[PDB]
Design an enzyme around this catalytic site. Structure first.
Site, short mmCIF file in Angstrom:
data_model
loop_
_atom_site.label_atom_id
_atom_site.label_comp_id
_atom_site.label_asym_id
_atom_site.label_seq_id
_atom_site.Cartn_x
_atom_site.Cartn_y
_atom_site.Cartn_z
N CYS B 149 0.92 -1.07 0.03
CA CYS B 149 0.26 -0.12 -0.24
C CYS B 149 0.99 1.23 0.27
N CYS B 154 -2.45 1.74 -2.61
CA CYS B 154 -3.47 2.87 -2.12
C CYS B 154 -2.78 3.75 -2.33
N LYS B 157 -1.00 5.26 -6.19
CA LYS B 157 -2.25 5.50 -6.26
C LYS B 157 -3.26 6.32 -6.62
N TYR B 291 -10.19 -3.94 -10.27
CA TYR B 291 -9.79 -2.75 -9.91
C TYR B 291 -8.48 -2.10 -10.14
N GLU B 295 -7.84 1.79 -12.49
CA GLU B 295 -7.99 2.57 -11.88
C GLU B 295 -6.26 3.03 -12.44
N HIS B 566 -28.51 19.45 3.46
CA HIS B 566 -28.58 19.39 1.90
C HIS B 566 -27.55 20.26 1.88
N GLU B 571 -26.93 12.08 0.92
CA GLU B 571 -28.79 12.95 1.64
C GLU B 571 -29.61 11.78 0.76
C1 LIG Z 1 -2.18 -1.46 -6.95
C2 LIG Z 1 -2.97 -1.61 -6.22
C3 LIG Z 1 -3.71 -1.07 -5.60
C4 LIG Z 1 -4.05 -0.81 -3.76
N1 LIG Z 1 -5.43 -0.14 -3.12
C5 LIG Z 1 -5.63 -0.37 -1.70
C6 LIG Z 1 -6.22 0.70 -1.80
O1 LIG Z 1 -7.00 1.83 -1.67
N2 LIG Z 1 -7.18 0.42 -0.17
C7 LIG Z 1 -6.85 -0.47 0.37
O2 LIG Z 1 -7.96 -1.12 0.76
N3 LIG Z 1 -6.42 -2.05 -0.01
C8 LIG Z 1 -5.76 -1.31 -1.31
N4 LIG Z 1 -4.66 -2.43 -1.88
C9 LIG Z 1 -4.74 -3.50 -1.27
C10 LIG Z 1 -3.47 -3.65 -0.01
O3 LIG Z 1 -2.09 -2.93 -0.60
C11 LIG Z 1 -2.94 -4.79 0.43
O4 LIG Z 1 -4.50 -5.13 1.08
C12 LIG Z 1 -1.93 -4.60 1.77
O5 LIG Z 1 -0.89 -4.39 1.32
C13 LIG Z 1 -1.87 -6.28 2.63
O6 LIG Z 1 -1.01 -5.66 3.18
P1 LIG Z 1 -0.12 -7.06 4.09
O7 LIG Z 1 0.60 -6.37 5.41
O8 LIG Z 1 -0.72 -8.04 3.88
O9 LIG Z 1 0.50 -7.34 2.67
P2 LIG Z 1 2.15 -6.26 2.06
O10 LIG Z 1 1.84 -4.50 2.23
O11 LIG Z 1 2.70 -6.55 0.89
O12 LIG Z 1 3.41 -6.68 2.96
C14 LIG Z 1 4.48 -7.75 3.14
C15 LIG Z 1 5.71 -7.25 3.08
O13 LIG Z 1 6.39 -8.41 3.35
C16 LIG Z 1 8.09 -8.20 2.76
N5 LIG Z 1 8.32 -10.00 2.40
C17 LIG Z 1 7.78 -10.54 1.42
N6 LIG Z 1 8.40 -11.85 1.44
C18 LIG Z 1 9.84 -11.58 2.34
C19 LIG Z 1 10.51 -12.43 3.30
N7 LIG Z 1 10.05 -14.13 3.03
N8 LIG Z 1 10.85 -11.76 3.97
C20 LIG Z 1 10.22 -10.81 4.50
N9 LIG Z 1 9.30 -9.36 3.95
C21 LIG Z 1 9.23 -10.27 3.09
C22 LIG Z 1 6.90 -8.11 1.09
O14 LIG Z 1 8.34 -6.76 0.68
C23 LIG Z 1 6.49 -6.44 2.05
O15 LIG Z 1 7.13 -5.23 2.44
C24 LIG Z 1 -3.75 -2.23 -3.15
C25 LIG Z 1 -3.29 -2.88 -3.71
C26 LIG Z 1 -2.43 -3.06 -4.67
C27 LIG Z 1 -1.71 -3.44 -5.67
C1 LIG Z 2 -28.78 31.36 3.26
C2 LIG Z 2 -28.84 30.42 3.79
C3 LIG Z 2 -28.44 29.33 3.97
C4 LIG Z 2 -29.33 28.11 4.03
N1 LIG Z 2 -28.33 26.85 3.71
C5 LIG Z 2 -29.09 25.51 4.01
C6 LIG Z 2 -28.63 24.65 4.09
O1 LIG Z 2 -26.66 24.67 3.17
N2 LIG Z 2 -29.18 23.20 4.04
C7 LIG Z 2 -30.65 23.74 4.72
O2 LIG Z 2 -30.58 21.99 5.66
N3 LIG Z 2 -30.80 24.42 5.11
C8 LIG Z 2 -30.29 25.41 5.29
N4 LIG Z 2 -31.23 26.51 4.95
C9 LIG Z 2 -32.16 26.69 5.63
C10 LIG Z 2 -33.63 26.94 4.55
O3 LIG Z 2 -33.34 27.76 4.23
C11 LIG Z 2 -34.73 26.69 5.32
O4 LIG Z 2 -35.01 25.48 7.12
C12 LIG Z 2 -35.97 26.43 4.85
O5 LIG Z 2 -35.74 27.24 3.58
C13 LIG Z 2 -37.58 26.11 5.58
O6 LIG Z 2 -38.64 25.80 4.42
P1 LIG Z 2 -39.38 26.51 4.30
O7 LIG Z 2 -40.69 25.64 3.83
O8 LIG Z 2 -40.46 26.35 5.87
O9 LIG Z 2 -39.81 28.43 4.15
P2 LIG Z 2 -39.59 28.53 2.87
O10 LIG Z 2 -38.97 27.69 1.78
O11 LIG Z 2 -38.92 29.97 3.22
O12 LIG Z 2 -40.60 29.01 2.48
C14 LIG Z 2 -42.01 29.58 2.65
C15 LIG Z 2 -42.58 30.93 1.36
O13 LIG Z 2 -43.47 31.44 1.21
C16 LIG Z 2 -43.34 32.40 1.24
N5 LIG Z 2 -44.15 33.15 1.65
C17 LIG Z 2 -44.53 33.67 2.84
N6 LIG Z 2 -45.68 34.35 3.63
C18 LIG Z 2 -46.66 34.49 3.15
C19 LIG Z 2 -47.41 34.43 2.50
N7 LIG Z 2 -48.65 35.43 3.31
N8 LIG Z 2 -48.75 34.49 1.72
C20 LIG Z 2 -47.62 33.28 0.64
N9 LIG Z 2 -46.37 33.06 -0.06
C21 LIG Z 2 -45.27 33.69 1.49
C22 LIG Z 2 -42.04 32.72 0.99
O14 LIG Z 2 -41.96 34.11 0.67
C23 LIG Z 2 -41.46 31.73 0.98
O15 LIG Z 2 -41.81 31.62 -0.59
C24 LIG Z 2 -30.64 28.68 4.64
C25 LIG Z 2 -30.99 29.02 5.33
C26 LIG Z 2 -30.50 30.10 4.93
C27 LIG Z 2 -31.15 31.80 5.32
#
Ligand SMILES: Cc1cc2nc3c(=O)[nH]c(=O)nc-3n(C[C@H](O)[C@H](O)[C@H](O)COP(=O)(O)OP(=O)(O)OC[C@H]3O[C@@H](n4cnc5c(N)ncnc54)[C@H](O)[C@@H]3O)c2cc1C
Ligand SMILES: Cc1cc2nc3c(=O)[nH]c(=O)nc-3n(C[C@H](O)[C@H](O)[C@H](O)COP(=O)(O)OP(=O)(O)OC[C@H]3O[C@@H](n4cnc5c(N)ncnc54)[C@H](O)[C@@H]3O)c2cc1C
Ligand SMILES: OC1CN(C(c2ccccc2)c2ccccc2)C1
Ligand SMILES: OC1CN(C(c2ccccc2)c2ccccc2)C1
Lengths: 586, 588
Positions: B149, B154, B157, B291, B295, B566, B571
């Site tokens: 790895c 891992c 890569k 993979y 990759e 949101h 979500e």
């Molecule tokens: C290209 C690639 C990408 C990968 N990407 C991911 C990823 O994104 N996520 C993930 O979870 N896994 C990934 N894996 C898998 C991950 O690398 C292995 O699951 C992990 O390395 C296994 O760990 P290990 O300790 O069993 O073996 P190793 O990491 O290979 O350790 C064994 C070590 O012992 C040494 N050794 C061997 N024989 C002897 C000996 N006789 N005496 C002494 N030392 C010795 C080896 O040279 C090595 O250093 C990837 C594998 C590859 C090939």
């Molecule tokens: C800047 C900002 C960022 C936000 N970011 C997030 C976020 O990332 N994630 C998240 O989960 N929440 C976020 N929120 C909160 C989210 O906007 C509110 O929780 C959500 O809009 C609540 O929905 P509502 O239906 O209760 O009100 P509203 O969506 O405000 O609906 C009320 C509507 O009724 C209308 N209305 C009002 N009075 C009357 C009336 N008398 N007659 C008719 N229509 C009327 C209004 O004009 C409006 O159109 C954010 C809020 C703000 C201000």
């Protein structure tokens, strides 16, 4: 018991059919309803825990006990009776018989109101949604969809993303690409164009979607004058009264302004920022909430000169160690802070140049908590909270009880003190103010009113993400809250710094990212709160919100294996406790 | 009962102090051990459920049942007074080093699992040695301490994967309002290799220093089990000798295979070579469909290479095939070419690698499709990714008695024990276990705890999440759809699914309906989530957290009642509703 459910379901549903899957006489009725464009709910008795009792209980309304059976409370007939109304042309008139114009009126077309409307319509409910956008003090206005779509979560995360792409231009050179970050600039109006273009496509999508569910969309301001009467007002001012059986209040909130001279006249709020024609320039952001910090973050990443005025603390209500780590990152990356400071007046030195498309100029005057003075910016954005304006929606005489903040007091099924009126979303007192919360309450509420459902919305342990330049994700209690509720002796905290692998070759910081797990010793080391600061924090946190909903403990995290190269895997091998005093660095 | 636990623990531990937290006589003995720099496991009895019974059983060894009791390699040493008599008499250090063999633990192989096992064994006072050696590749590539790895897996890569993603980050920036012209930007392969190799080099050094500061002997030598307690080591200077250890852990990993065709070993390379290559590959043929092959093919295309993948039968055998095919369709639409149902016959040299000017050679590749038609094309580089295998012949004398399956992997019980009772195996050479780096760390850290600390926790290998780091990433946890259907029958399987589009892709004008997710659920078991699958950006970060809920038996109801965050991709899992049986379209 079952008696009370059935009487409730039959009374509020517009068109409902009691049925069985194996029954053939029912499919004949379904086919007639299907053919005649009659939408309806359907209860298949054979898959309910007490279908025998329900079937017997139905006789109390229809004086029969067989299973193809209702319109707006009235028994209509069995298959023979319904086919006879069909054949003789009587069927369409009975299904439209109603004491009111609509089965449901939704006041407010945002995240909750649009979602409640579309779901009711699917079960046969005759449905209207109202939406109107009172302009900002300078006249900014927008289309259907609510606050998130137009001036909330959608344009701010796109703008967040413009800002993140700036460090991607920095990081690209170290991974071998020829570009030079130092001679690239950012064009604001080009960005606003793309963002607005996407918002307009959501404005259009929602209008298309109500048309296709046969929802009446009135672009009009609504007012509950009586439990079933809604007074509406045109864009031409024409006033009229519509009637509805069930009312859902879903009107949301708007930004506050401090009562100081020059605030309303020369400053703006987030309501105006996301469609502003010119770059704000040198900007003072007044406030310390997630709106204020999030906006100040991307303006800084896009090159702007940006200052934040903090009255007391950052992110009140969130875990304060994470709040401070969030703040330290911004202060180290551009954003300037005026701490323990408050504004007293805005004076105008230049007027906004509409012609040449340029901001104005302003003098800002205030004081620090010790008395010392604060005294120029081109833009002042106020982000000092949000509030409903229910006096404009809800005549006092109707009877809808409000809490001291102006929000509606509701039972745990969203019902107000007036038995046919409900409230959802931001104006529902004591609920998390989030778009996904508004949508789930609205959909589940609509199923209970018109389809016989019983499921409630669960508002506990709802996860969050603050989209500051380094994002911060959370689920459950803060650290200080856990200690306040259970005692320090009963709280264990596992924590660790980390470094994203993508930051190694890019030469970014070693120990700024941070995560912790707040646990309860006496409850098998139960996870009370999860906190992560780092990139993609929202994607990291979401999945964990399911396991916390299920009562996850520290053992459940230990026994799960991580996915390697990720940031999120660090939660699966945490071991250094705060009481141990051992350092959390890497 | 409890008694045979206590004897397995006392017989195996190196230094172990049975103690109690509140006991003041114990705290005096702790500090004597801390001063004289003597590390040890500690079993506090007032914090285990049935420590009162264990107090009685300690008499079976020591004829007492009082609290402070020290043992060294299965021998009772003394109570508080006797260990203080040993200290002030210049006797404690000789008794604690009294050992039948040179080491308490010999780890053969310093990779993901071996280094992890050694480090955690040294914590509890085991005298530990960890051997590592890197047999060079046919063209002579070589690397340092860390394993597959760290050096050729891992870590390099994902960094090259990351360089590839920044290509599209540069394209997107124009649409978000930045002034650059993606058209006029190119990549430099050698600049990238220097950064990746620098970060690797820092990891080599960190492991040497971690081992030094844990008091673990690191021998850069090839090891060989000759008897159940004897390991023979060969120097870098060809020098041979014999050390002995009480417990042995085999952790020697795997290496890439080559197909038996003319030219392959002579003129091809593998992944072991690709991550330190001095020249850019140029026009490249990748043979295989795992993979690794997808990759690597993915980031070379993203960096701007002219890339072809030769697929014998299918992509990503063993994974969900609907997902595999969506992966492959994305790649084919973004510049990776495939030669489908094709296999190679020989590699001919046309031009030798130019070591001086730093340029690749020229090769001719000849093969044939299953339809009989011939393949013939020239490629500057050819990379084999056609599997990985252990070489236990070089590690394991047949006479020792370690039993192996038909593939060459070590058969083990569920606590990693071989057929020889003092020898264990961890990581890629453990038969039937997920071959993943986090798995080899957890196996390693938990085994050491059981041997030298009296821990009982086993490694749980089921439902281990994965992520394939193709240009569009693919995260998975649990059974694939065809596996659940086979195991429970199609009428008992419900699949919820949906397309999605990241918010970041809207302003960037990227595709509407390529990203996709699904939940594979069992009806008759409360709609239990059997498998989760997501194709999209950041699939690793999306999938991880759900692996906890799945370990806990999550159902579709548990996903329904949880609320979304949101602006996220993730979500979409909380509001899925379209079923496959329903036949409703999943598009956005
Ligand atoms: C290209 C690639 C990408 C990968 N990407 C991911 C990823 O994104 N996520 C993930 O979870 N896994 C990934 N894996 C898998 C991950 O690398 C292995 O699951 C992990 O390395 C296994 O760990 P290990 O300790 O069993 O073996 P190793 O990491 O290979 O350790 C064994 C070590 O012992 C040494 N050794 C061997 N024989 C002897 C000996 N006789 N005496 C002494 N030392 C010795 C080896 O040279 C090595 O250093 C990837 C594998 C590859 C090939
Ligand atoms: C800047 C900002 C960022 C936000 N970011 C997030 C976020 O990332 N994630 C998240 O989960 N929440 C976020 N929120 C909160 C989210 O906007 C509110 O929780 C959500 O809009 C609540 O929905 P509502 O239906 O209760 O009100 P509203 O969506 O405000 O609906 C009320 C509507 O009724 C209308 N209305 C009002 N009075 C009357 C009336 N008398 N007659 C008719 N229509 C009327 C209004 O004009 C409006 O159109 C954010 C809020 C703000 C201000
Ligand atoms: O004068 C005090 C410093 N305080 C904030 C602060 C800290 C760092 C950067 C900017 C601001 C802060 C307080 C509390 C929670 C989080 C941050 C105001
Ligand atoms: O992108 C294309 C689809 N991929 C293959 C494929 C991948 C997964 C499962 C089945 C098939 C393939 C198609 C047809 C013949 C042989 C292989 C490569």
């Amino acid at each position: 018991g079952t008696s009370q459910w059935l009487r409730k379901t039959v009374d509020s549903a517009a068109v409902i059919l009691f049925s069985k899957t194996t029954c053939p006489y029912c499919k004949k009725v379904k086919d007639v309803l299907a053919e005649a464009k009659i939408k309806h709910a359907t209860i298949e008795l054979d898959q309910l825990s007490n279908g025998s009792a329900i079937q017997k209980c139905l006789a109390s309304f229809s004086k029969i006990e067989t299973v193809p059976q209702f319109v707006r409370g009235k028994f209509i007939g069995d298959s023979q009776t319904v086919l006879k109304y069909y054949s003789n042309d009587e069927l369409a008139g009975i299904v439209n018989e109603s004491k009111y114009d609509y089965d449901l009126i939704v006041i407010g077309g945002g995240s909750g109101g649009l979602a409640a409307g579309k779901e009711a319509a699917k079960y046969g409910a005759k449905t209207a949604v109202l939406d109107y956008v009172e302009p900002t003090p300078i006249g900014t206005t927008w289309g259907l969809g609510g606050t998130c779509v137009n001036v909330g979560c959608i344009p701010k995360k796109l703008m967040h993303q413009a800002g993140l792409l700036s460090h991607a231009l920095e990081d690209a050179e170290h991974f071998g690409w020829s570009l030079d970050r130092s001679k690239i600039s950012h064009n604001w109006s080009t960005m606003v164009e793309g963002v607005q273009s996407h918002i307009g496509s959501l404005n259009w999508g929602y209008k298309v979607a109500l048309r296709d569910n046969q929802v009446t969309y009135l672009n009009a301001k609504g007012r509950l004058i009586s439990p079933h009467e809604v007074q509406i007002t045109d864009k031409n001012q024409k006033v009229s009264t519509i009637t509805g059986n069930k009312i859902i209040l879903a009107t949301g909130e708007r930004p506050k302004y401090p009562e100081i001279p020059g605030a309303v006249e020369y400053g703006i709020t987030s309501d105006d920022l996301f469609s502003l024609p010119y770059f704000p320039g040198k900007t003072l952001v007044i406030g310390a909430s997630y709106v204020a910090l999030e906006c100040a973050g991307f303006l800084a990443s896009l090159g702007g000169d940006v200052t934040v005025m903090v009255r007391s603390i950052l992110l009140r209500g969130f875990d304060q160690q994470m709040a401070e780590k969030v703040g330290d990152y911004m202060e180290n990356h551009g954003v300037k802070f005026a701490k323990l400071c408050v504004p007293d007046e805005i004076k105008q030195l230049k007027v906004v140049d509409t012609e040449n498309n340029k901001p104005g100029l302003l003098l800002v005057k205030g004081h620090y908590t010790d008395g010392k003075k604060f005294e120029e910016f081109e833009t002042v954005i106020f982000a000092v909270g949000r509030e409903p304006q229910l006096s404009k929606v809800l005549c006092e005489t109707v009877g809808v009880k409000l809490d001291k903040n102006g929000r509606v007091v509701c039972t745990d099924d969203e019902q107000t003190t007036v038995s046919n009126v409900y409230a959802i979303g931001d104006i529902n007192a004591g609920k998390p103010q989030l778009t996904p919360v508004a949508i789930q309450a609205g959909r589940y509420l609509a199923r209970r009113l018109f389809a016989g459902a019983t499921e409630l919305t669960d508002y506990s342990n709802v996860a969050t993400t603050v989209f500051t330049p380094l994002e911060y994700g959370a689920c459950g209690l803060s650290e200080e809250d856990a200690i306040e509720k259970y005692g320090d002796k009963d709280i264990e905290v596992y924590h660790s710094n980390f470094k994203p692998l993508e930051w190694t070759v890019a030469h970014r910081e070693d120990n700024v990212c941070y995560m912790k797990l707040v646990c309860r010793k006496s409850d098998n080391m139960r996870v009370l709160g999860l906190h992560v600061l780092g990139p993609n924090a929202g994607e990291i946190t979401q999945g964990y919100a399911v396991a916390i909903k299920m009562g996850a403990t520290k053992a459940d995290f230990d026994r799960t294996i991580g996915i390697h190269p990720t940031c999120s895997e660090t939660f699966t091998t945490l071991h250094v406790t705060k009481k141990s005093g051992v350092s959390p660095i890497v």
